[PDB]
């Protein structure tokens, strides 16, 4: 194959639906292991200030027992077959999945339906998980990146439910009752909002029969989603006891289904990423990475394209000592401007190659493919094939990158989060002025 025949030879995601509206999607291989999961259109952005944290609490109680499998029994079953049960929650999505052997798919599927359908939500377990969730909140406080991105979401989407954190404030953790959680599950764990994905040695017809045997009870065939205003704003938490400062800056980027995402991702690949444990250092094609390695300006920087249904965070996060924040801002915004006005074809080619490599390398293993299927059916209503992603990347050039980075970056108000010894984090007006060029 020539990577054009290899893309054309990738197995096809097969999608069906139950009468209740539960979608069933699978990518089959010849591997002897599979990943099967449920992805739900439920998150913190669906929570208000009183219920905020309920979804994380329900994820916490997910494996602690159902009416059929009390307490540890479920875990025992999973552990007794060599399978791995995992879960996660975001501001928009929730997922419960099993990594099992291909011959364990029936039981795995059964284990999932029970988990999403019949969680006990027992009050004793609710108190134990209350204690656990409080300790995990204090554990999350120690992670400067998690805090700085929660801050970025809180100031960018202030007044909206997208500013909410996934876990909610600790006061809600202490106040959430069983009635709160049962209401959350009854309003958000619905078949039309769920996707049963499976990647690996899984036949779609057999998975569909399993879903019709285990999920057909679910809601047949309503509060959901209001848009979230973006705000140019800054939140600076100064703690000079912290050794390194974290700075996250983002403009309003596109939502999930916007084609602008493909050129913008290309542009982010042009800026790239860095940390001080890199081989390439000063020789890196990314200008910011080479300046950061030559001057030791930062410990790391990453570009990001966070997407929600209708908006997102397009920007960069960097970590540096107190005396270099300013420099890190100057060279980062400059790169943004250099892309808006003078993108240049060869680095667009490099960024396109980086994006194709990221997309292909990410989908390695049954679990990434299962997540791709579930999250893709939630965000696009479809699994976009890699051949299509390649078609969209192939139609990117320096004119396209210049135009889209102009549309999203140039002369736009960013949202800014600073955490730590951030006295040298530039004043908001100085950053905002760094978002345009007078020469241009």
């Amino acid at each position: 194959a020539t990577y054009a025949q290899a893309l054309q030879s990738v197995p096809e995601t097969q999608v069906s639906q139950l009468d209740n509206g539960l979608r069933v999607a699978s990518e089959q291989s010849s591997q002897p292991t599979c990943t099967v999961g449920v992805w739900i259109d439920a998150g913190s952005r669906y929570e208000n200030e009183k219920n905020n944290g309920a979804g994380y609490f329900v994820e916490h109680l997910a494996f602690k027992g159902t009416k059929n499998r009390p307490g540890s029994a479920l875990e025992k079953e999973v552990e007794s077959m060599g399978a791995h049960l995992n879960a996660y929650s975001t501001r928009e999505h929730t997922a419960y999945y099993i990594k099992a052997l291909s011959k364990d798919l029936p039981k795995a599927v059964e284990l999932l339906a029970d988990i999403v359908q019949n969680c006990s939500l027992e009050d004793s377990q609710i108190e134990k998980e209350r204690d656990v969730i409080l300790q995990e909140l204090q554990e999350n406080d120690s992670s400067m990146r998690d805090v700085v991105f929660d801050y970025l979401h809180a100031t960018a989407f202030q007044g909206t439910p997208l500013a909410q954190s996934v876990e909610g404030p600790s006061e809600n953790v202490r106040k959430l009752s069983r009635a709160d959680l049962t209401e959350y599950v009854s309003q958000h764990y619905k078949a039309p909002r769920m996707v049963l994905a499976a990647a690996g040695g899984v036949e779609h017809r057999q998975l569909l029969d399993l879903a019709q045997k285990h999920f057909s009870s679910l809601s047949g065939t309503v509060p959901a989603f209001t848009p979230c205003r973006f705000t140019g704003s800054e939140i600076r938490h100064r703690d000079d006891a912290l050794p390194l400062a974290h700075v996250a800056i983002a403009v309003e980027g596109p939502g999930w289904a916007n084609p602008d995402n493909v050129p913008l991702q290309v542009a982010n690949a042009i800026i790239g990423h860095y940390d001080s444990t890199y081989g390439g250092g000063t020789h890196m094609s990314s200008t910011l990475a080479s300046v950061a390695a030559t001057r030791k300006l930062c410990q790391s920087f990453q570009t990001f394209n966070i997407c929600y249904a209708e908006t997102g965070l397009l920007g960069a996060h960097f970590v540096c000592d107190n005396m270099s924040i300013d420099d890190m801002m100057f060279f980062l915004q400059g790169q943004w401007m250099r892309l808006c006005t003078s993108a240049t074809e060869s680095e667009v080619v490099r960024g396109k190659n980086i994006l194709r490599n990221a997309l292909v390398s990410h989908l390695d293993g049954t679990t990434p493919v299962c997540e791709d299927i579930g999250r893709s059916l939630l965000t696009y209503g479809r699994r976009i094939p890699l051949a299509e992603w390649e078609s969209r990347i192939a139609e990117v050039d320096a004119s396209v990158v210049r135009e889209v980075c102009s549309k999203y970056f140039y002369d736009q108000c960013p949202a800014v989060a600073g955490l730590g010894p951030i006295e040298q984090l530039p004043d908001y007006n100085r950053i905002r002025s760094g978002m345009f060029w007078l020469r241009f």
């Binding site: 530039p426 004043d427 007006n429 100085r430 002025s433």
Partner: protein, 54 residues
């Protein structure tokens, strides 16, 4: 706070207000703060009735 955006613009506003007062003087009462006797050429023989500095 950094000097540039805040006190450059504030100092520019202050300079414009100062220019307003100065130009009101120059264009509407040029001789308000001066003395008519300096429109008379110096006469070492005659002294002014009042000799005040500025």
């Amino acid at each position: 706070i950094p000097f540039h955006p805040y006190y450059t613009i504030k100092d520019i506003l202050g300079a414009l207000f100062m220019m307003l007062i100065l130009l009101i003087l120059v264009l509407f009462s040029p001789d308000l703060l001066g003395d008519p006797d300096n429109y008379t050429p110096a006469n070492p023989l005659n002294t002014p009735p009042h000799i005040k500095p500025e």
